[PDB]
Design a protein around this ligand. Structure first.
Ligand SMILES: Nc1ncnc2c1ncn2[C@@H]1O[C@H](COP(=O)(O)OP(=O)(O)OP(=O)(O)O)[C@@H](O)[C@H]1O
Ligand SMILES: Nc1ncnc2c1ncn2[C@@H]1O[C@H](COP(=O)(O)OP(=O)(O)OP(=O)(O)O)[C@@H](O)[C@H]1O
Ligand SMILES: [Mg+2]
Ligand SMILES: [Mg+2]
Lengths: 47, 464, 516
């Protein structure tokens, strides 16, 4: 009976890590693509 | 008739000519540079037409110490390099001048560096089972005679050592002519390779050509074409099997990017020059075996920061048939060959032309390693005590197999005192069948590390 | 000297027929060149996409206009271009000579026989740029276009006039599926009337010549060389050929489709075409956008892949089917071209590499694949036999995720897990082995009813194969019935049950036990 609740709480706590990591990954992807496009347009317009 | 120089910047130089005197594309030009201590003869190759009797080109020598108004002369011909039997046992630079003897080799016939790929009507697939003495290449990805073979991996993984071992093992058992080309590498490696080749009698049978990185980007972009010209001349007329080794391919693409930055073209994604794929495809089409002539080429390709998403490796992968890549995780683990079996593949590995036992063993070992890779994280976090009996048995078998793929080679003599060891194919097949059956599980961990043969395994077992 | 007589007669007939005329035309001059493009000035009036002509014999096309300059692209050889040449405006928008002698040969993207075979005949010239069929000239889709693969036609059906996409990771087996489908139609061709006949075409872009030679050898050995043609644009060619080949292939297929013959276009790769277009656009100094791509790139694909569609009975009821192939890297789908091509077509077949690593050879993902047409393109018999195994497989994988470490389960749960495992192990199949419809239906019926639930999962496939062979040897009525009525009868089911029982009574693999 004591064992069961530990697994329950473990799963409940494990979900939020997935959520936070997903948010961080999306933010990083957006930053990378916008940086790349800014750099390429700046390089192209300079000539 | 002669022109003048109006602008100079970096390596690129533009020149002016009078009416009815502009040369066609890819024509050599000579320029004179004078000084108290810096006297040379600049060699330039035409790049593009700017109109108004102006032509922009690049140079193969440093442009330090040049002054405007100096006349530029034309030869009305393309770059050329002497060829023949006398080329054997000598060292040449990009321009073709003999480095060992300044005056040697200035009387043979000459061929233009620019050529044409062979026509499509004379192509034929080549299928042959070429066997070496190394376990991983013999079992996972067998090499193909007369086909493409290449490596992959980041910096400091051990590709050059593998190339040296491979050439040492093969050139002793070859009746044809081999040619070595060095695009980019430290001078120490070239000097040591020359000394090592001189330590045996094989040097007289091969020809070496290479340029270094300290030279301007013009030279780094032309060595491969000269090497291909020599190899093609040897193949076409003698009708003899040839061996070709290329140290790197990334270097000349880097040089092309550098020069195209200044030439005036717009950049592209990840700051690469446009039309890199076209140039790579045009160059890679030269190495090909016709119906009656066979040539075997081994190349090494570098990747930046272990990223396969980079466009250049992705583009150059499509030109290969048999491939073997290296990983850094296995190198950090400790295994010396550092070959990852999961991602590597071949193009002759099917039971149609190979015995079915090979196919079955390969499939079984691949499945076992894949399952271990899957169970990795659970084993690391929750521990081995949580899994069932089947998972524990597969984990132990995976550990045994992963340790067993290691093997010592002769080229490791300089680094470690262990001598070389070689094993045939059938013994490896039987040993892998025994291991995958699961009748060697009683041995300890260290008994399966750096083992050449089964008898050596037994001897090490009796030593603990 | 009969051949000599014919040669002399041909030479004399040609030489005595020499004639030429003196007509005026506009000629311009080149001002600059290099990097695969050249600038030409002096032409007063030239249509866009005109096929120019150069003194050395090389060709070119006009893309960019200006107040005093005309851009150009050199298709073939490039080193002969130099300042001082004279261009000559000729003809009109370029076209392709299409006919019926193209079968069983390999041609240049421009329409030249690069093969060692002699020259080909010509029937009529068709321009590449033509409007697609309108919205009031199409029917609904209803036809069983077989593919020869159990998983593909069991999960995602394909019908005539339906565009289906295959997106895969490196070294997965897309070309093997394409080749199996392309050669599955030998029996269809062997029939007399063209109602079953299909004329297929292949396009290869940016590939090594040895690979094309191997593919041709495989098709020739398969015996399907008689009713196919190949267009090849190897890597050695300039960007123009790689950009222009698919239009030529589509036009050649469309000419056949327009006269009432079913066809099947296949595009080997589309990323290479996009890369070539990007290179040309960047070299012509046009504004760039995201990922260094021009804005109109999406429009490009919409102009090409939309040609194929089912026709109505008023115009002859032709058809055309396309199978574009896309390559993705690092199991990433959010890239530009993958998203565009996914949103432009319908139906997908994802090819994971983890599945191909171990177990399944076809390695087709099931939980993401979808077909829009669905049951409208199925056969009644196999639709009845299907029994909605999709949900069974889904709950099977969902439960077997749990039951890996679980030994005490519900009996029905264990039965469902065993059924799912048996179906998954059944669904595998080797290469170069197409299957006809009747044996597929028989195997699926064997799988669904639970007849093989007593067979150990380790050696099912071999057993199944043997049964099929035996069924083909001592029995032929069931195949005739399913071929004639396209429906499974109850009496045939009873006979098949008796055959299965009597065969399973006498089969052993390892300590086996025949049971009720
Ligand atoms: N099989 C091996 N035996 C002995 N040493 C090895 C082996 N494989 C790798 N090493 C060691 O790993 C390093 C690899 O050296 P090396 O410079 O050849 O690397 P590389 O990744 O091939 O790069 P490069 O092209 O710059 O030479 C060396 O320190 C070498 O001693
Ligand atoms: N059903 C199968 N059974 C066994 N082996 C298969 C099967 N299908 C494919 N293979 C093997 O998988 C590999 C796939 O090669 P293929 O020519 O299809 O390339 P691909 O994965 O489509 O990739 P690419 O076009 O990028 O080269 C080959 O080695 C082929 O023999
Ligand atoms: Mg090295
Ligand atoms: Mg393929």
């Amino acid at each position: 009976a004591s064992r069961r609740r530990a697994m329950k709480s473990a799963t409940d706590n494990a979900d939020d890590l997935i959520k936070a990591l997903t948010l961080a990954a999306n933010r990083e992807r957006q930053a990378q693509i916008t940086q790349e496009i800014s750099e390429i347009v700046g390089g192209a317009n300079a000539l | 008739t002669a022109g003048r120089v109006v602008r100079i910047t970096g390596p690129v130089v533009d020149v002016e000519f009078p009416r009815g005197s502009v040369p066609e594309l890819f024509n050599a030009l000579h320029a004179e540079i004078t000084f108290g201590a810096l006297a040379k003869t600049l060699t330039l190759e035409v790049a593009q037409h700017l109109g108004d009797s102006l032509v922009r080109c690049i140079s193969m020598q440093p442009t330090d110490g040049l002054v405007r108004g100096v006349e530029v002369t034309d030869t009305g011909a393309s770059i050329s390099v002497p060829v023949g039997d006398g080329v054997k046992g000598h060292v040449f630079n990009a321009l073709g001048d003999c480095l060992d003897d300044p005056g040697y080799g200035k009387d043979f016939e000459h061929w233009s560096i620019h050529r044409k790929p062979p026509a499509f009507s004379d192509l034929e697939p080549r299928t042959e089972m070429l066997e070496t003495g190394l376990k991983v290449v013999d079992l996972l990805t067998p090499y193909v005679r007369g086909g493409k073979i290449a490596l992959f991996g980041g910096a400091g993984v051990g590709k050059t050592v593998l190339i040296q071992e491979m050439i040492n093992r093969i050139a002793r058992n070859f009746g044809g002519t081999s040619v070595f080309a060095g695009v980019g590498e430290r001078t120490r490696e070239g000097n040591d390779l020359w000394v090592e080749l001189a330590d045996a009698n094989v040097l007289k049978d091969t020809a070496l050509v290479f340029g270094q990185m300290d030279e301007p980007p013009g030279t780094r972009m032309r060595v491969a074409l000269s090497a291909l010209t020599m190899a093609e001349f040897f193949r076409d007329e003698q009708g003899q099997d040839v061996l070709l080794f290329i140290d790197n391919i990334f270097r000349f693409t880097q040089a092309g990017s550098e020069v195209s930055t200044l030439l005036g073209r717009m950049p592209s994604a990840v700051g690469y020059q446009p039309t890199l794929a076209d140039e790579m495809g045009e160059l890679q089409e030269r190495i090909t075996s016709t119906r009656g002539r066979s040539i075997t080429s081994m190349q090494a390709v570098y990747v930046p920061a272990d990223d396969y998403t980079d466009p250049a490796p992705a583009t150059t992968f499509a030109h290969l048939d048999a491939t073997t890549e290296l990983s850094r995780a296995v190198f950090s683990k400790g295994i010396f060959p550092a070959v990852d079996p999961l991602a590597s593949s071949s193009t002759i590995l099917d039971p149609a032309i190979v015995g079915d036992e090979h196919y079955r063993v390969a499939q079984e070992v691949i499945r076992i390693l894949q399952r271990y890779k899957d169970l990795q994280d659970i084993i690391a976090i929750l521990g081995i005590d949580e899994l069932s009996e089947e998972d524990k048995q597969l984990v132990n078998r995976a550990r045994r197999i992963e340790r067993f793929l290691s093997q010592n080679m002769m080229a490791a003599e300089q680094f470690t005192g262990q001598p070389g060891s070689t094993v045939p194919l059938k013994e490896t097949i039987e040993a892998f069948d025994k291991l995958t059956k699961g009748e060697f599980d009683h041995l300890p961990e260290q008994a399966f590390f750096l083992i050449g043969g089964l008898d050596d395994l037994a001897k090490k077992a009796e030593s603990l | 000297t009969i051949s000599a007589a014919d040669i002399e007669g041909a030479i004399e007939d040609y030489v005595s027929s020499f004639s030429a005329d003196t007509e005026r035309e506009e000629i311009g001059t080149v001002i600059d060149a290099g990097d695969g493009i050249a600038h030409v000035e002096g032409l007063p009036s030239v249509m866009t996409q005109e096929l120019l002509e150069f003194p050395g014999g090389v060709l070119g096309v006009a893309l960019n206009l200006d107040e005093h300059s005309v851009g150009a692209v050199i298709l073939g050889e490039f080193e002969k271009i130099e300042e001082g040449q004279q261009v000559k405006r000729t003809g009109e928008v370029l076209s392709v000579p299409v006919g019926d002698a193209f079968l069983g040969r390999v041609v240049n993207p421009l329409g030249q026989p690069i093969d060692g075979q002699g020259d080909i005949a010509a029937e009529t010239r068709r321009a590449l740029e033509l409007q697609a069929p309108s919205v009031v000239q199409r029917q609904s889709v209803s036809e069983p276009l077989q593919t020869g693969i159990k998983a593909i036609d069991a999960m995602t059906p394909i019908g005539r006039g339906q565009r289906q996409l295959i997106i895969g990771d490196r070294k997965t087996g897309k070309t093997a599926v394409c080749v199996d489908t392309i050669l599955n139609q030998r029996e269809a061709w062997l029939t007399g009337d063209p109602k079953q006949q299909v004329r297929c075409v292949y396009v290869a872009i940016g590939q090594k010549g040895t690979t094309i030679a191997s593919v041709k050898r495989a098709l020739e050995e398969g015996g399907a060389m008689e009713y196919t043609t190949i267009v090849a644009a190897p890597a050695s060619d300039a960007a123009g050929f790689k950009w222009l080949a698919p239009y030529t292939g589509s036009a050649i297929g469309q000419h056949w489709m327009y006269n009432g013959k079913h066809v099947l276009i296949v595009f080997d790769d589309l990323s290479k075409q996009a890369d070539a277009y990007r290179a040309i656009s960047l070299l012509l100094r046009r504004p760039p956008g995201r990922e260094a791509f021009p804005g109109d790139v999406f429009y490009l694909h919409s102009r090409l892949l939309e040609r194929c569609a089912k026709l109505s009975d008023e115009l002859g009821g032709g058809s055309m089917t396309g199978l574009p192939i896309i390559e993705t890297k690092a199991n990433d789908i959010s890239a530009f071209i993958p998203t565009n091509v996914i949103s432009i077509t319908d139906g997908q077949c994802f090819l994971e590499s983890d599945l191909f690593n171990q177990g399944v050879r076809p390695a087709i993902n099931v939980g993401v694949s979808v077909s829009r047409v669905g049951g409208a393109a199925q056969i009644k018999a196999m639709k009845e036999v299907a029994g909605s195994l999709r949900l069974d497989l889904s709950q099977y994988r969902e439960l077997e995720a749990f039951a890996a470490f679980a030994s005490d389960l519900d009996a029905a749960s264990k039965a469902q897990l065993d059924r799912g495992a048996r179906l998954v192990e059944l669904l595998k199949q080797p290469q170069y082995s197409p299957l006809a419809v009747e044996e597929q239906v028989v195997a699926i019926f064997l799988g669904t009813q639970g007849h093989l639930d007593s067979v150990p999962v380790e050696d099912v496939q071999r057993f199944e194969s043997e049964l099929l062979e035996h069924v083909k040897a001592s029995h032929s009525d069931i195949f005739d019935g399913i071929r004639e009525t396209k429906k499974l009868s109850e009496e045939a089911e009873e006979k098949l049950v008796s055959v299965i029982n009597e065969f399973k009574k006498g089969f052993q693999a390892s300590d086996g036990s025949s049971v009720v």
